[PDB]
Design a protein around this ligand. Structure first.
Ligand SMILES: [Ca+2]
Ligand SMILES: [Ca+2]
Ligand SMILES: [Ca+2]
Ligand SMILES: [Ca+2]
Length: 124
């Protein structure tokens, strides 16, 4: 052993957005190791106190770090409505880190899960 490996993780642990922000942006980071490799990482949302379909969009997919890339941005739609609510949150999970051919070259780091605070923008 004694060789460094790439680490995948969110740039921040918590993100924020007004309910009228349209979409919230999370940044996935890839650090160290051999950056000439192609690395795949899956992402996926989960409900907290905010619910998919009424507060945000169920969003999922896969990010691909091409050689030399150290940062990838992802978007989650925020559903704006006209009703009063508490400030809520949902989760976004990284998983399934794989290296491409042509798994300790690349690993999931910490934080592999980010939280998203949605501030309500309505009165009552
Ligand atoms: Ca709600
Ligand atoms: Ca809402
Ligand atoms: Ca609103
Ligand atoms: Ca609302």
């Amino acid at each position: 052993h004694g060789i460094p490996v790439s680490k995948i993780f969110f740039e921040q642990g918590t993100y924020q957005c007004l309910e009228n922000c349209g979409t919230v942006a999370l940044t996935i980071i890839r650090r160290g190791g051999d950056l000439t490799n192609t690395v795949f990482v899956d992402f996926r949302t989960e409900d907290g106190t905010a619910n998919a379909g009424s507060d945000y969009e169920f969003t999922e997919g896969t990010v691909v770090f091409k050689p030399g890339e150290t940062q990838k941005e992802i978007r989650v739609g925020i559903i704006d409505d006209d009703i009063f609510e508490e400030d809520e949150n949902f989760l976004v999970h990284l998983s399934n880190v794989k290296v491409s051919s042509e798994s300790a070259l690349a690993c999931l780091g910490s934080p592999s899960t980010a939280t998203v605070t949605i501030f309500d923008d309505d009165h009552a």
